Design a protein around this nucleic acid. Sequence first.
DNA 1: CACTATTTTCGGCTACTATAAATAAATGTTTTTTTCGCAATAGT
DNA 2: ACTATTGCGAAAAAAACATTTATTTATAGTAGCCGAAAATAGTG
Lengths: 100, 337, 100, 45, 50, 180, 172
Amino acid sequence: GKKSSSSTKDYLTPPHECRLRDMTYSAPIYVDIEYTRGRNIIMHKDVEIGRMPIMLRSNKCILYDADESKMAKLNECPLDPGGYFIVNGTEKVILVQEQL
Amino acid sequence: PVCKNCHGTEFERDLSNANNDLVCKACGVVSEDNPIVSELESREATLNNARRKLRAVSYALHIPEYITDAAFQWYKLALANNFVQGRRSQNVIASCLYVACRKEKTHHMLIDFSSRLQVSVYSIGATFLKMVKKLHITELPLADPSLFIQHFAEKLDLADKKIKVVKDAVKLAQRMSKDWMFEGRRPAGIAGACILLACRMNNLRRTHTEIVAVSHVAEETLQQRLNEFKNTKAAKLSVQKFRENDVEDGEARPPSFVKNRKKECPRNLHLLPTTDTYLSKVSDDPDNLEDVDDEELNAHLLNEEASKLKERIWIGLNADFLLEQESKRLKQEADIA
Amino acid sequence: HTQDIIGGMRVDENGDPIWQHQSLGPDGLGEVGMKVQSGQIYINKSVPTNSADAPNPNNVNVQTQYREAPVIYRGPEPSHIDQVMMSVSDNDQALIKVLL
Amino acid sequence: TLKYICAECSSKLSLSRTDAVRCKDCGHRILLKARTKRLVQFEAR
Amino acid sequence: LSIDKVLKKPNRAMEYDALLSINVHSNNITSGLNRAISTGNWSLKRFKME
Amino acid sequence: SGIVPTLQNIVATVTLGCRLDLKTVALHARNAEYNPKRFAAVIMRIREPKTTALIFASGKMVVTGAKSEDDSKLASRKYARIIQKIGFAAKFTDFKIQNIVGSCDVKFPIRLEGLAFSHGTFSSYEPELFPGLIYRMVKPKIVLLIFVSGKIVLTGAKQREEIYQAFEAIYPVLSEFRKM
Amino acid sequence: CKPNFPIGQISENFEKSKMAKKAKLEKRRHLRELRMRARQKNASIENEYKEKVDENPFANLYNYGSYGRGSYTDPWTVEEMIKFYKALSMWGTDFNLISQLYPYRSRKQVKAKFVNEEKKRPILIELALRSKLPPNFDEYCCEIKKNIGTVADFNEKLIELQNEHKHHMKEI
DNA sequence: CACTATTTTCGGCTACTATAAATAAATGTTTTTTTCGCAATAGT
DNA sequence: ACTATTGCGAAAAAAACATTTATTTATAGTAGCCGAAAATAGTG
Ligand SMILES: [Zn+2]
């Protein structure tokens, strides 16, 4: 999600705006790393590696704890359950498996 | 294409009842029925290796695929035109895909290709002009700096009112386009200054260094630009105030002839000096050379007692012929054993 | 370096609309609010005929290469165009999505 | 005319062709075609 | 494998940095996840089950 | 205007029938400069006529630093006079000229991107690698470069006459779209 | 309101701009004192002993002036001029031995200083041609000042060392 | 209120690719291929 | 263990072939490092 410098929530695409452009509703992966450049060793913050597609109504999405006014501005249904991905357009969900 | 009765040239397909028969328009005879639908290796190994590498930097620079596949043909011909031999592998592909980036007129510069691989800009710039000259690419888009202003704002993380600061920046740049600076100057430089001037008037996000993380140009050569527009015309009008509504051209002063000044029928053929009269001045004696004699070049000669003295220091700075000697002596040893 | 163009409404006998072109609009995008029947192209899509030819680094004869490849509305019943939007994907690449 | 309108900027504008895909007054990049002025006909059953 | 190819060089052994080329492998965790979710078949290695 | 492009460097090579040894021409000279690890030949420099001499261990020799044309043949044969001290034949037969460079002044500021858009099929440039433009002219097979200051260096003449008809060719072609 | 540096509004996160810019001058400050001083499991242990530092993205920033040939030459002194003009007067023009005279100076910029003296003082180089004679006899001290470092007569001593070496081939 | 010290403020300078176009012996490497060695592996 | 059969691995090398060595014009353009000077602010 967020960086450590700005310490903001994030700036993120809306999910309904994402589902009309056939995009993957994702969130970036940030790590901090320490390594040996040379004569001195050096630690760097906020290295981006990739983008994590994250389910709706999770605490990392902007739909978490809305008041049908932000969600009015983000034109999502309040009665939607959530719990599904928006990879490249079509909305998919992982089923609950079982085994022995 | 030709009917059998009326020799009709146009054919219409009927999709109404899904027979999908093809009928000529004039007389109505069917043309067809029952449609039938469809339900070196080392040369290959080196391109499949190279297929990885031009795709490699496209992930880094956020290059969409229609540039990477378009530059693949430029590498395909330059391999065939014997351009790939001798040069380094990473240099011949980094010069390749920039040409496709220029045809798209993208925001990407050239200096970002040298960035990770830790060379100079004109290191891989040297192989670039050898590509366009040898492979005869005549047409090319100009390096338009107006693209760079729009891309700089996103990583500049400025205020939410970012559209007005670009619309003001481009009207500054269009006013500065009619001005007389960027003709031999740098497109990254002058586009690193006009967006610096527009953001100055509304916020203090100007810190002379945060834009250098974007534009990648020295803090002092952009300050030269901040002085350069001030002294031509109508800058003092808008130094302090004066909303961006004027339409003026002013005088024409490229800052090149001022320093030249501050320092200070066609032409007939039989008036310019010739060439073979200068060739025929002194005689062409092949072996003899005693017609250019003088007294200083005759005295241009060694010192006789310093012949041993000059070579003593010359052999005192010898370590090559020391190291060279056993290379010849091991050559004798390696020849026998 | 060739795009795809939306040229439309070829005309005949002092009028724009052919029987296939009463609902195709000025820009080649089907006009919002009117019905369509069998035939009656609603998005006109034109493709370059040099789809895989090698790039000759010149501009000598590029003026007439767009052959038509439209999408015909099939179906047995007349339907209406509700609205149409156009946008960009994650790469710089345009989209056309109409909802009948 | 009454050409392309934006989603939430909702600003009437006439895009010139093959030039941009975004709207003015906002960086939002989804825009709608407005309804024509042309008459249309219906029934009442 | 993208660093030891460089570390076997005499001249490029002092000034070399690693995370200048972190972005070349960055697009192998996005298109791996977005394929596994779009096409619902997860090909693993440690268990080898399909 | 009646301006003439002055000529700055004239280079020339001749053949030599005798093979050179680096010991006997460097260790008893005055401008002794030879680093075998750095450069495989001996240089020497004279204040008059301010030319520079360069040899080859195979025997051959090439001169540069000549301002005038007749002064090149003066300097090249004085370079042969030192080789007469050593027991070498030191002969010169063919005084070939292949490389004559000139500089000029025009003294009115021009645009260059205007002709780079019009005459772009045959001449072009890159701005961020080099400030000037690179001009091609295959009718005498001459290539050269222009600036934004007007002043145009006429580089690389294989023949001294070859540039003169090329010199006044481009200047009326350049003067168009004059600034105002 | 001149465009050069007024402090005038919010300027968010300006300190990382200020911290890196002020630290840049300290970077060249260590490189000045290096010049004047020249005038005069087990692998991880020393990796712990190395300097640990946090990276701020403004510090490592690169421009066109990066990763390129050349550096800033030390400007010449009048003390160097008298040892320059004396060897310039004895020999014709020999870059080789005078590079060793100035120990940390290289072959490249002493060639450029010959080019530097051409336009600057064009009359001193005309006397350099004309000065082909024994000068004011003070160079004999500078003759043996060249000969006091590693005192070994190379006309006679620097022969036997290859005679030692060429004997080794006849053994082997 | 006024000195003293300093942080700018401003060139000043010095370099430095370029460019072609020679000359040329290196002087690099590249691909392409071929050679040659060792370890890889498994059966002595 | 040790010797033999194997595949690759690394390196030659070949042929090419662009990349370096020293010239001279500048011209405008960066870019780095250095004072040169000048105002300004702490503090007497
Ligand atoms: Zn808008």
